[PDB]
Structure formats: C-alpha cells, structure tokens
From a paper:
The binding of mature IL-1β to its cognate receptor IL-1R1 on nearby cells and subsequent formation of a ternary signaling complex with IL-1RAcP triggers a pro-inflammatory response with the production of inflammatory mediators, such as IL-64. hIL-1β belongs to a family of 11 cytokines that all share the same β-trefoil-fold structure despite divergent amino-acid sequences (IL-1α, IL-1Ra, IL-18, IL-33, IL-36α, IL-36β, IL-36γ, IL-36Ra, IL-37, IL-38).
The X-ray structure shows a short hydrogen bond formed between the main chain carbonyl oxygens of Lys93 and Met95 and the phenol hydroxyl (2.5 Å) and the indolinone lactam nitrogen (2.8 Å) of the ligand, respectively. These two polar interactions anchor the ligand in the cryptic pocket and are thus critical interactions between the ligand and the cytokine, as shown by the lack of binding of the methylated analogs 4 and 5. The indolinone moiety (ring A, ring B) binds deep into the hydrophobic core of the cryptic pocket facing the side chains of Val3, Val47, Pro57, Met95, and Val100. The para benzoic acid group is H-bonded to Asn102 Nδ2 and makes water-mediated interactions with Lys55 Nζ, Lys97 Nζ, and the main chain carbonyl oxygen of Ala115. The binding of (S)-2 to hIL-1β did not perturb the conformation of residues at site A. In contrast, in the ligand-bound state, loop β4–5 adopts a conformation that is incompatible with the receptor-bound state of the cytokine at site B, which thus forms the structural basis for the antagonistic activity of (S)-2 and its analogs. Intriguingly, the minor form involves residues Val47, Gln48, Lys92, and Lys94, which are all critically involved in the formation of the binding site of compound (S)-2.
Author numbering: 1 to 152
Write the structure that this text describes.
Amino acid sequence: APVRSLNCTLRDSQQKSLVMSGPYELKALHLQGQDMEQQVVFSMSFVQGEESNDKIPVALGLKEKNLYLSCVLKDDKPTLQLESVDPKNYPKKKMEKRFVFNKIEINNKLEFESAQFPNWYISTSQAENMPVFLGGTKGGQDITDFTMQFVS
Ligand SMILES: Cc1ccc2c(c1)NC(=O)[C@@]2(c1cn[nH]c1)c1cc(-c2ccc(C(=O)O)cc2C(=O)O)ccc1O
C-alpha cells in the first residue's frame, strides 16, 4: 500500500510551538510573531486510504526527511529521540516500528501514541522552553494533545 506525506506544523493545546534545540531535541514555547519562522516543519507520512479510521499510524520526519521522531528505551524507560536517516529511502512503505505513532483525533485535537510503547505519548510541559518528551500519563499537568497546521 502506497504512502502519502503532508507538510505541517504542530502546536500543543496551550498554543506552544515546536522548535529545534540543537541536533537532538525539540522544545516547546509560545513564539513571538516575528520568530514564527523558527517552528519545525514536519513531513507527516501515513498509508493512503486510512482517512476514515480512528487510529492512523503516522511517521514524523523533519529537516527535509533527514531526521525522524523515534521511540527508544533509554535507562529502561520509553524515550523520544531525533534519529538520523538517509533521506533517499524515506518515507518507507514499511516504516520501522520505532518511528510510528498512532495519530488519534480526540475533541478536534491530535494525540500521538507510540506504537512501540503503548500508553506513551508525545508530550510537552506546561512551562516554557522545555523539551518535547514521551510521557506515560494523561490528564495531569503534562500536555499530550496538539493541533496541526498544513504548510503544503
Ligand atoms: C509512513 C508509514 C507509517 C506507518 C506504517 C507504514 C508507513 N507502513 C506500515 O506498515 C505502517 C502501517 C500499517 N498500517 N498503516 C500503517 C506501520 C504500522 C505499525 C504499527 C502501528 C501501530 C500498532 C499498534 O499496536 O497500534 C502496531 C504496528 C505494527 O505493525 O507492529 C508499525 C510499523 C509500520 O511500518
């Protein structure tokens, strides 16, 4: 089955934009209007024909597909990383499981659950300029829902 890609930006439910913070990390903060160009453009890839399903596996690439968001164990704990890939072979028709998230649309917002680590989600802190991380709790102070804005 063929793969479809969309370019987009992500904002958490409290309107914090996502930006790079060096080569290995994303941070979330409320950006000023003139700094809006700092927000990361993602290439969200998924399999064509699943638009009506409740859970849609997605891969999130960035840097013109040079990096992908990846879920790996670090110190025996699910961790979000930015993994380097050869952009020529991406996105794959069969993406490696560590790059896959179930995109679930709840109350008009988006939630990204790790396919490799169930009940672990892409998360942000309430505080400004803190790293984007994989979190195991929902409903607490950590934010697990986002809105998406299409670039192309
Ligand atoms: C671009 C793109 C994204 C995502 C995928 C592809 C390409 N190609 C795929 O095959 C892909 C897919 C299958 N259906 N739709 C897309 C896929 C799905 C899973 C997956 C997701 C959720 C769960 C769960 O437990 O909820 C289990 C698994 C698993 O299969 O272990 C793992 C690897 C994988 O690559």
